[PDB]
Amino acid sequence: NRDPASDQMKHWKEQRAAQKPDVLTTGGGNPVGDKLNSLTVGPRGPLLVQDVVFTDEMAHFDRERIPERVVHAKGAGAFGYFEVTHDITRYSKAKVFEHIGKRTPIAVRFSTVAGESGSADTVRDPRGFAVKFYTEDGNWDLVGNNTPIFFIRDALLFPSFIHSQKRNPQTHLKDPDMVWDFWSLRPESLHQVSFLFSDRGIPDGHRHMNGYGSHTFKLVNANGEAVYCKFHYKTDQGIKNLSVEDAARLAHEDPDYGLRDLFNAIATGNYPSWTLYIQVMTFSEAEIFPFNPFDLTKVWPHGDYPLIPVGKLVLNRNPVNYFAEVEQLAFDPSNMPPGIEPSPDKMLQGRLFAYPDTHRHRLGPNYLQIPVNCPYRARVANYQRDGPMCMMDNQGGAPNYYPNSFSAPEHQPSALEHRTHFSGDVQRFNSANDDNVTQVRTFYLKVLNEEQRKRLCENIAGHLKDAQLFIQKKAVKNFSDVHPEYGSRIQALLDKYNE
Amino acid sequence: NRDPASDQMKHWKEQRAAQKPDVLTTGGGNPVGDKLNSLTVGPRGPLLVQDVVFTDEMAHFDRERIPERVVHAKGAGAFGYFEVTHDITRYSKAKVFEHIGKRTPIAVRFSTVAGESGSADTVRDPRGFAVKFYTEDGNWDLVGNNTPIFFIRDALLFPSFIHSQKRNPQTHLKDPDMVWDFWSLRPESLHQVSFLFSDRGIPDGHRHMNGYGSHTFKLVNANGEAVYCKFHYKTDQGIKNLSVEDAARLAHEDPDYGLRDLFNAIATGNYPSWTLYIQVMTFSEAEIFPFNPFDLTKVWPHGDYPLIPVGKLVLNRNPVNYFAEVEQLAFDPSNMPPGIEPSPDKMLQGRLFAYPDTHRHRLGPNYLQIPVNCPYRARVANYQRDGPMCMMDNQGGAPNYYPNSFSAPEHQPSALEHRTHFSGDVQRFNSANDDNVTQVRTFYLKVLNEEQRKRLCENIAGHLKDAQLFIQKKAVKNFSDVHPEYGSRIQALLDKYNE
Amino acid sequence: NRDPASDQMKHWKEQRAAQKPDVLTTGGGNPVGDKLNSLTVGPRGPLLVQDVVFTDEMAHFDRERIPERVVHAKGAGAFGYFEVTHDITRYSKAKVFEHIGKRTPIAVRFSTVAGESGSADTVRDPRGFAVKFYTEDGNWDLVGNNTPIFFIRDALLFPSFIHSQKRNPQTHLKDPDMVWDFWSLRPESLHQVSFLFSDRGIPDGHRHMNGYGSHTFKLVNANGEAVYCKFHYKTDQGIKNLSVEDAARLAHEDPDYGLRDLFNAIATGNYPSWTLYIQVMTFSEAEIFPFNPFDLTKVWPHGDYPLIPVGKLVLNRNPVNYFAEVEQLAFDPSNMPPGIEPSPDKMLQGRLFAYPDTHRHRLGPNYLQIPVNCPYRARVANYQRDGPMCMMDNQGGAPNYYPNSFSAPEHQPSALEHRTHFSGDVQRFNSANDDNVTQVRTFYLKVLNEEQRKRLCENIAGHLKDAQLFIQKKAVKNFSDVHPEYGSRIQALLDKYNE
Amino acid sequence: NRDPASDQMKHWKEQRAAQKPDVLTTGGGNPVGDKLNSLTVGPRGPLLVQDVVFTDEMAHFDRERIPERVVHAKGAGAFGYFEVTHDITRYSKAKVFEHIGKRTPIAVRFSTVAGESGSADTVRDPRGFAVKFYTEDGNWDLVGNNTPIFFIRDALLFPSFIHSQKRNPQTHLKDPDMVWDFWSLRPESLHQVSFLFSDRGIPDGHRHMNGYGSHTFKLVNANGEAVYCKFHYKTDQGIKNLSVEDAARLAHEDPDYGLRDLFNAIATGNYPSWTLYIQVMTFSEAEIFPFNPFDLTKVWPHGDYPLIPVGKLVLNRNPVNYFAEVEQLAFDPSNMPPGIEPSPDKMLQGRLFAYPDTHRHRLGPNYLQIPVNCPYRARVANYQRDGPMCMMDNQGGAPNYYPNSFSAPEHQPSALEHRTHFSGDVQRFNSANDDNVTQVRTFYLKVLNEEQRKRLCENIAGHLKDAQLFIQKKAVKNFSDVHPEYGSRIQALLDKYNE
Ligand code: HEM
């Protein structure tokens, strides 16, 4: 035989075996006599408007496509569960961490960042690793990546960053001038750029990569006491990457390498797993941290803030219909149940708005009613009504204003957010200089060895060689600030490339 | 006490025993701690983006509205059943007519025509009377009106006719010049105009008016023999009309008079019903009919084509949530099950295209997936997939191309359409002069009495009086062609009006 | 001849006189041969898909409607100019106030609140009075009402209040229980309710009422000094209202009363104008104001904060096409040029988000590209691109990321917002008990005269009578809390109504 | 210094000499003070909703994407002109052919078929070659391909065909079982499958392939006489194809090979051109053609129906903004000016409906208002109005109903469609067995040589080898019907591949 993925139809047919074909109908449920020949006057005559079989089917075909995700368009999904294995109730009261052995269903979507829906999986790019927890207190979406950090630290630079990574607005071609002019002008990108151009830049499928929340988050316990945290979910299959050589080969031999790998792993029973950890920081410590605790361009040293086990994530089910279950999947960082709150991270703050907003556009106003997006483990009861494609019963005839004297849904005091104190002027504080090299120099010296640093520079130079000399100069100058050797090596490569 | 419509909330309240009210949540199912006070920095400080309770609720409120129907925007709905009382299987093989006593659930929506969603019920205008039969062979939508005829007989004049009935493109005001310039210029409208301005122009609610399929349709039997027909559903409540004075009064007194009437009636167990009849014309008869059997401005004389009893239409269930079950209702004339087909009526032909089209716009590509529009009494299976707001399971992993060797849905030759022969050039044949008066004269002097011919001419003059003199002149000419008296009478009234 | 509005087409034909009427075409610009008859095979044959003239027209007709505004759906628009008459330069550096006599084009839309698109103009309800200033520093949208205050003072309560003012979720009928239960439970609305049921409750058209920014705003001068302010625009044609009985008759005789009045006033050269004033309050004063200066339910006493003249608002141009210039008009309170900023008013803060949001839904992502919404006196230059229905050149080939070394647009520090210092815990502060009767007492006793007080209570009782008894009790209990005579006078009339 | 495409930004920067950079504004035209830092309370405080610069920008970024084309999603565009070189006014009265030398502006888009927006250009697949002619009689869209024929001859199988060529609905992977099951079940696909797997399957860029209307169309002269025709635009650059190995190389090295090649060619002054010809068939010859002349799987032998020269197509201008000028480009086969009409081709008949339909979904109801889609060389004037994103003036205050007595646009008899007669039963005539091998045999034996037949069979086997054996067998059967050796040679390859 061949892989399970390849036998998808063969298997569907087999699953039906005995049963005979169902009757083919129009969208309105009308049986059709012949869906292979159009209705005309005479065998060589005109098509009739009276052929509603044709119109019904073609019209739907004409409307199959929806906008792809503005970012992370190319992805793959699966479903499974989360199981608590350690008690962290001292930090969070979230019913999802409620007690060891507690399992909560989950939905996951892996993806690249820049490429469109037709792009290849095995290419250098960060990797999305979004997890949706269907908890009793509604859904909790942990929208992380395969890296604990990011290129920028203020949401205002996000649209620009993404544009620099995508296509030139006139030629529609990738543009090295755009990529590096941006990166060279914004030195804060050094930390994640180093990671991206390291071996971890091209993971071997979605099962051999780590997942992180990246953002500092806030956990609150049953006492009302809070602590800041970081979510870490390490791959139990272990880290494994593709050489720049195999990745290019797979890019054309099988652009859906990641998708195929995941589906087959699950179909064969080789369920992928991750171990979820959290490193905790107290407000006292946060106020002492040598760096901005909420600066997305920085990590919390494992030595000072050890990883603590929380539970395990297992994907043991492939989607049945990809469009309905994966393409329409929607993760909102703002989706947080009692016990988990956001931090002041400027990037996370912006994401609180961005996701539901883009989901209302890409999917629709009632996108939370799409099966895979419904918090089906909780009871949605509120004063929201109508909107296009209003499914279910739209909460029936329940009073639609609050407060009301007719017993409609009520407050839940115990669900109040944790109160924190803040003081300062309301202004746009520049964070462009919040130390852009310190942690990068260490990544470059302690995280990577001599051979890894070797590839790191070859990959950077291989891409940067296409940018204008003045951009290469600014670019090199930045790497040099991190460490003189960092810049010198790349400059050496560029001198050769520039021949 | 008060009527049931007024105690809607009182009943919702008392029908929940002492049941503890539900927990107020976000669209994502997250419990809300306080949804009466926004999140700010200090008692008099600015609002935070972090307040996702606010954004989640406001963003949905911001998207509650959807485009109202392009016509028939103001209406009311109710649900019930259809019940066969006579065997007409000799004429049609449609499963809905299967056997005596067979019941099929129906959905109904009554409406005015020109007024927008905020308009008054008690106004002069035809009345939409659409019936959706959820049959085993899919949904059958009989999209009728409270009149057996219409103003025009070609779909190309429909948007123009509707534009003339609505608002002036610049002032946004009703424009008697547009109304009468169009009717005067197109005399085929005489018949229905005569009906509209007679007492039946303003029914007393929806329960006291008849329903008509209006168009000539085609019924096919098991033997494959065909015949043409007209559907008639007479009110078992009796014909009742509102006086011009009472209607004007109710316009401001109760703009939703029809809504209330229907809801309270069903709420008090006073279920309105209609008796469905059909007229039958053989193909032979159609070849010799003195008029075009498919001319929408003509009725079939009951003296040659008597009403044939079929079944009963009963409404005994009010909607629970109006937006979900009524505003979202979509009737498509093209939704016809085996045994019922369209005739060459040009207006009907046009409608085969228009309804599904506007629904894909007004509601969305997958509107047939909205609960009320779903053919839940049939098994929908085809090769259509995806589209925005895709609920269900999108037919899982079933093969999506036809034909296929994997046991997916198969068409069924039993559902093939009856075959009619046609010969002719592909041209735009004129129908503007297909006898515009013959049947109108008989309606004026043979169908109406003097007591109401007086009322007919008054109503017409009361409206026509505001169009320019040249428009009135022409309009009067048409009324004269029907009958010199008809014209003269109207002219006299106008003469007094013009002072 | 009749009134201008009535002669709209007559006048269109006249200005066209002598000109050969344009060739009618498809949306694609192809000339049409006969748009009055469909293409069929034979006179009484089937309609052809080949009839693309029919489809092009019918498909656009089927897509004519867009969702109506979620609130303020029924309205009227006009255009004109804003003229600076006085110098408020020491307060605001905004270019629109630059020099005495300076003219800035304006767009204005008047409207009711609860009624949908087809509702009547002359009904009890607040009046929208939105003004868009097309300034060199971009558009400034002063989205005002005919009242200085509002029913609530926290945005979270807005969707509920509107829900209570519209239709019952099941019956689709107006529901006094919903209306008064909400008002009963939230007494902060007493001030606006009192204003709403006074004679001002039903203005004689839009030309005889004042406008107000309602909210407290912030003005900043060239030196960086800020003050808080209130915007008031009083009518130059004087306050004039319709009696309950007069408004009621007009409701059915001319539901577009306001529309007609405005169009005719302008068409006949009787341009309506308003004088814009501001009240100023220094930061020191806001600090000692008897109430929360940012509470939308409070006004600023004229004796302590005199109206300071600013300029004139003149409407001298009617819309040419209503849908394009009025239905499509979008006002965003967040559209504020340098020199004008928001205050901490919680309601206003919520509005900063809501309008752009609903506009992207109702109109589309690029609604600011619709002519009437375009800041045509400014040069839009930024890093935003694409989106559905992208017009113009989408900023051509300009670098689309910021920062960049290719001279694309640059931010301007002078446009930086004014820095205010805020301190406090981050939480949901209860504002439900922020003095709900003080100014209402003054309103009832000092502002109104026995004559007015009389029918103010009769207006209230006439509507509150339909609510359930327990609701009437609490409502009266809130009026008595204002002034015993207020609540007692209501009770007397109620007792009577309950026969 | 590099290729023009690579220097896009450099050239733009240089094009703005010393001109000062524009001021950065919000969508509403308000200058932005600092677009690089968000508005927060203190340097490490929360984000404020008051930051309307952020929300304005992010909200638009969140809405950048629109559905990609259901098919032909990956493509490139350019602009230029059409020039008449020969006189064919004896066949067509279309203004575009009016006289020798006559120049008419054109827009062109090249594309692949199955791949999504991120897919590679150098892949085996047919190639789209749509040409939009902006004529005075409106736009004429000749939506062609790089092949004169297609896989199927009835539109009802188009959605299925495209589905079979796309991703598996469950695994989201290309599925050879789907591809070959469909093809093996529909042998009519043999002709185009043979052209597809030949050298032609992978042209070298877009400048080295021919164009074809594929369908048989109808031309009508000034005397009302009509002939059927075929459109052919041969590349003046000459046919040039990519080796299977070089295609897989560019597939990963430059997924945008075709995009780059075209832009550079035009940028460097090396304008690509095509010579336009027509094949003509009288109605008499049509009656005697050995095959259905309207059969899309058939070509008209050049020996019997010689190519007649008409003019040249030249592309001399690159788009400035790709999204606005190419991504939003909409071609409707139904856009045909007088003198050019459709034939009875069942496939073309379906396309008359599908394109404007999908465009109203992908782009919007008023997509014909997007600049690149407007028929700017004509005057659009009709009775269509409103719709979302209505630009310009919506035809102002012009009467909106037809007919009318107010001088609004009038139809033109000279534009009536040609008259053709048809007689026959209205039914679904089976065309599945309309000779599926005769011309395919001629192609395999006469058009190709041994060298080419060898590659053809290798290419087919290379893909077919991955489908199930039963599918392989049925597929080989069909090839054997074309020619015993055709099938045998492939079988030989298969046996090898099958291990
Ligand atoms: C200023 C900050 C950011 C903004 C405004 C932003 C915006 C977006 C948007 C608009 C989408 C598309 C959502 C959809 O269409 O469903 C997206 C997807 C995604 N983003 Fe971000 N993002 C930001 C930072 C990040 C960071 C730091 C991470 C990781 C912690 C992240 C991980 C992802 C992932 C994995 C997805 C794909 C989710 C899926 O598979 O459905 N984003 N982002």
DSSP helix/strand/coil, A42: coil
Are D498 and D366 in a shared domain? no
Residue with tokens 């609903």: C358
Helices (H), C136-175: 158-165
Residue C388 maps to a domain: no
From edge to edge, which strands make up the β-sheet containing C421-428? B39-41, C421-428, A420-427, D40-41
CA distance C210 to C195: 13
* CATH at residue B334: 2.40.180.10
Of the residues C374, C393, C424, the one at which a domain ends: C374
Q: Inter-chain contact B324–A60, Cβ cutoff 8 Å?
A: no
Are A334 and A457 in a shared domain? no
Are B88 and B212 in a shared domain? yes
All residues of chain D having their beta carbon less than 8 Å from the beta carbon of residue B42 are: none
Between the alpha carbon of residue A261 and those of residues A265, A318, B317, the distances in Å are: 6, 12, 53
Are A102 and A176 in a shared domain? no
Residue with tokens 């090649």: D261
CA distance C346 to B45: 8
Helices (H), D323-433: 346-362
Residue with tokens 């739907």: A60
Q: Atom 22, ligand 1: which residue's CA is nearest?
A: A351
Helix axes D8-15, A176-185, angle to 10 degrees: 70
Are D135 and D168 in a shared domain? no
Are C369 and C261 in a shared domain? yes
DSSP helix/strand/coil, D127: coil
Q: Which member of C34, C64, C157 has the closest CB to residue B36? A: C157
CA distance B358 to B366: 12
Chain C CA closest to residue B115 = C118
Residue C94: strand pairing partners = none
Measured from the Cβ of residue A197, the count of other Cβ atoms closer than 10 Å reads: 21
- DSSP characters over D131-196: EEEEEBTEEEEEEEESSS--S-SSGGGHHHHHHHHSB-TTT-SB-HHHHHHHHHH-GGGHHHHHHH
Residue with tokens 């093989």: B93
Residue D91 Cα, ligand 1 centroid: separation in angstroms?
Answer: 58
User: Exposed e or buried b for every residue in B388-405, given b needs 16+ CB within 10 A?
Assistant: bbbbeebbebbbbbbbbb
| Residues in chain C, total | 499
Count of the separate structural domains present in chain A: 3
Counting atoms of ligand 1 from 1, which one is nearest the CA of D62? 10
Residue B96's contacts (CB-CB under 8 Å, 6 or more residues apart) are B82, B84, B102, B104, B133, B135, B137, B140, B337, B339
Of these residues, A30, A60, A139, A145, which one is catalytic?
Answer: A145
For D41, the domain range is: 1-65
DSSP helix/strand/coil, B219: strand
CA distance B260 to D159: 47
Are C358 and C329 in a shared domain? yes
CA distance D177 to B141: 39
Q: Is A418 a catalytic residue?
A: no
Question: Could you give phi then psi for residue A104, rounded to 5 degrees?
Answer: -130, 130
B300 is in an annotated binding site: yes
Residue A32's contacts (CB-CB under 8 Å, 6 or more residues apart) are A24, A25, A26, A53, B411, B412, B415
CA distance D453 to D201: 13
From edge to edge, which strands make up the β-sheet containing D421-428? A39-41, D421-428, B421-428, C39-41
Q: Of A117, A129, A143, which is best to mutate to test ligand 1, by the most ligand atoms within 8 angstroms of its C-beta? A: A143
Contact D426, C46 (CB under 8 A): yes
Residue D410: strand pairing partners = C23
Contact B23, B30 (CB under 8 A): no
Choose among C116, C243, C495, C245: nearest CA to B253: C245
Between the alpha carbon of residue D480 and those of residues A116, B213, D180, D444, D486, the distances in Å are: 40, 56, 15, 12, 6
Residue B423: strand pairing partners = D423
Residue A136's contacts (CB-CB under 8 Å, 6 or more residues apart) are A95, A377, A378
- Which chains have 3+ CB pairs within 8 A of B? A, C, D
Counting atoms of ligand 1 from 1, which one is nearest the CA of A109? 40
DSSP code of residue B47: B
Q: Is C172 a catalytic residue?
A: no
Please work out whether the CB of residue A145 comes within 6 Å of at least one atom of ligand 1. Answer: yes
The 3-state secondary structure of C171-190 reads: CCCECHHHHHHHHHHCHHHH
CA distance A228 to A230: 7
Choose among B30, C296, D498: nearest CA to A382: B30
Residue D426 maps to a domain: no
Residue with tokens 């638009």: D60
Between the alpha carbon of residue C262 and those of residues C208, C236, C267, C316, C350, the distances in Å are: 10, 14, 8, 10, 31
* Percent of chain D as helix, strand, coil, to the nearest 5: 35, 20, 50
Choose among A182, B57, A160: nearest CA to D64: A160
Residue B387 maps to a domain: no
The beta-strand segments (E) located in D203-251 are: 211-212, 217-220, 226-235
Q: Inter-chain contact D181–B401, Cβ cutoff 8 Å?
A: yes
CA distance D448 to D198: 9
The beta-strand segments (E) located in C43-96 are: 75-84
> Amino acid identity, residue C430?
N
DSSP helix/strand/coil, C241: strand
CA distance C92 to C223: 10
Q: Touching check for B40 and chain C: CB below 8 Å?
A: yes
Residue A86 Cα, ligand 1 centroid: separation in angstroms?
Answer: 29
CA distance B477 to A208: 86
Q: Touching check for B424 and chain D: CB below 8 Å?
A: yes
Choose among A61, A62, A169, A65: nearest CA to A117: A65
CA atoms within 13 A on the CB side of B85: 15
Residue B160's contacts (CB-CB under 8 Å, 6 or more residues apart) are B182, D383, D400, D401, D402, D403
End-to-end CA distance of chain D: 51
Residue C75's contacts (CB-CB under 8 Å, 6 or more residues apart) are C109, C110, C111, C112, C128, C326
Contact B266, B316 (CB under 8 A): yes
Residue A353's contacts (CB-CB under 8 Å, 6 or more residues apart) are A334, B49, B55, D55, D58
Choose among D19, C48, D467: nearest CA to A6: D467
User: Which two three-digit tokens encode residue A312?
Assistant: 């395990």
End-to-end CA distance of chain C: 51
Resolution to one decimal, Å:
1.9
Residue C108 maps to a domain: yes
DSSP code of residue A48: B
Measured from the Cβ of residue B488, the count of other Cβ atoms closer than 10 Å reads: 14
* Percent of chain B as helix, strand, coil, to the nearest 5: 35, 20, 50
Question: Could you give phi then psi for residue B189, rounded to 5 degrees?
Answer: -75, -15
Strands B138-145 and D217-220: unpaired
- Which chains have 3+ CB pairs within 8 A of D? A, B, C
End-to-end CA distance of chain A: 51
- DSSP characters over B316-355: EE--SSHIIIIIT----TT---TTEEE-S-HHHHHHHHHH
Between the alpha carbon of residue C72 and those of residues B58, B68, C251, D390, the distances in Å are: 16, 16, 17, 21
Q: Inter-chain contact B401–D426, Cβ cutoff 8 Å?
A: no
> Amino acid identity, residue B145?
N
Q: Touching check for A46 and chain C: CB below 8 Å?
A: yes
Q: Atom 11, ligand 1: which residue's CA is nearest?
A: A71
Residue A331 Cα, ligand 1 centroid: separation in angstroms?
Answer: 9
Q: Which helix (H) or strand (E) holds C136?
A: none
Residue C208 maps to a domain: yes
Chain C CA closest to residue A48 = C48
- DSSP characters over B57-88: HHHHHTT---PPPSS--SEEEEEEEEEE-S--
Question: Could you give phi then psi for residue C31, rounded to 5 degrees?
Answer: -65, 140
Are C230 and C352 in a shared domain? yes
> Cis before residue A403, ω within 30 degrees of 0?
yes
Q: Touching check for D51 and chain B: CB below 8 Å?
A: yes
Q: Which member of B21, B328, B338 has the closest CB to residue A31? A: B338
Residue D96's contacts (CB-CB under 8 Å, 6 or more residues apart) are D82, D84, D102, D104, D133, D135, D137, D140, D337
* CATH at residue B162: 1.20.1370.60
| Smallest Cα distance from C418 to chain A, Å | 8
D355 is in an annotated binding site: yes
User: Which two three-digit tokens encode residue A321?
Assistant: 């219909």
CA distance A94 to D126: 55
Are B344 and B324 in a shared domain? yes
> Amino acid identity, residue D204?
D
Please work out whether the CB of residue A142 comes within 6 Å of at least one atom of ligand 1. Answer: no
Residue with tokens 């694409």: C386
Contact C48, B156 (CB under 8 A): no
Q: Touching check for D485 and chain B: CB below 8 Å?
A: no
Are A125 and A273 in a shared domain? yes
CA distance D119 to D109: 16
CA distance C335 to C138: 8
DSSP code of residue B31: B
Helix axes A52-61, D346-362, angle to 10 degrees: 40
Residue A23 maps to a domain: yes
Please work out whether the CB of residue A70 comes within 6 Å of at least one atom of ligand 1. Answer: yes
CA distance C371 to A426: 35
DSSP helix/strand/coil, A380: coil
CA atoms within 13 A on the CB side of C350: 26
Contact B183, D405 (CB under 8 A): no
Please work out whether the CB of residue A191 comes within 6 Å of at least one atom of ligand 1. Answer: no
Residue C384's contacts (CB-CB under 8 Å, 6 or more residues apart) are A159, D27, D57, D60, D61
Residue A496's contacts (CB-CB under 8 Å, 6 or more residues apart) are none
Residue C373 Cα, ligand 1 centroid: separation in angstroms?
Answer: 31
Are C469 and C454 in a shared domain? yes
CA distance C116 to C173: 12
Residue B45 Cα, ligand 1 centroid: separation in angstroms?
Answer: 30
Choose among D144, D124, D121, D120: nearest CA to D132: D144
User: Which two three-digit tokens encode residue B162?
Assistant: 């509707």
Between the alpha carbon of residue C496 and those of residues A58, A332, C461, the distances in Å are: 65, 55, 10
CA distance A86 to A100: 6
D200 is in an annotated binding site: yes
A234 is in an annotated binding site: yes
Q: Which helix (H) or strand (E) holds B130?
A: strand B128-135
Residue C110's contacts (CB-CB under 8 Å, 6 or more residues apart) are C75, C76, C77, C127, C128, C129, C206, C258, C262
**Method for this entry:** X-ray
Residue A397 maps to a domain: no
The 3-state secondary structure of A56-113 reads: HHHHHHCCCCCCCCCCCCCEEEEEEEEEECCCCCCCCCCCCCCCCCCEEEEEEEEECC
Q: Touching check for D499 and chain C: CB below 8 Å?
A: no
Choose among C165, D312, C257: nearest CA to B174: C257
Q: Inter-chain contact A41–D326, Cβ cutoff 8 Å?
A: no
Estimate to the nearest angstrom the gap between the alpha carbon of A214 and the chain centroid. Answer: 11
Question: Could you give phi then psi for residue C214, rounded to 5 degrees?
Answer: 65, -65
Contact C464, C194 (CB under 8 A): no
Choose among D401, C115, A286, C448: nearest CA to B181: D401
Of the residues C65, C100, C118, the one at which a domain ends: C65
Q: Inter-chain contact C25–D398, Cβ cutoff 8 Å?
A: no
Contact B227, B281 (CB under 8 A): yes
Estimate to the nearest angstrom the gap between the alpha carbon of B42 and the chain centroid. Answer: 55
Are D25 and D139 in a shared domain? no
CA distance A159 to D205: 32
CA distance C39 to B482: 30
CA distance C102 to D462: 76
* CATH at residue C15: 4.10.91.20
CA distance B151 to B297: 7
CA atoms within 13 A on the CB side of A257: 24
Q: Atom 14, ligand 1: which residue's CA is nearest?
A: A69
Of the residues D332, D348, D374, the one at which a domain ends: D374
Residue A135: strand pairing partners = A138
Residue D440 maps to a domain: yes
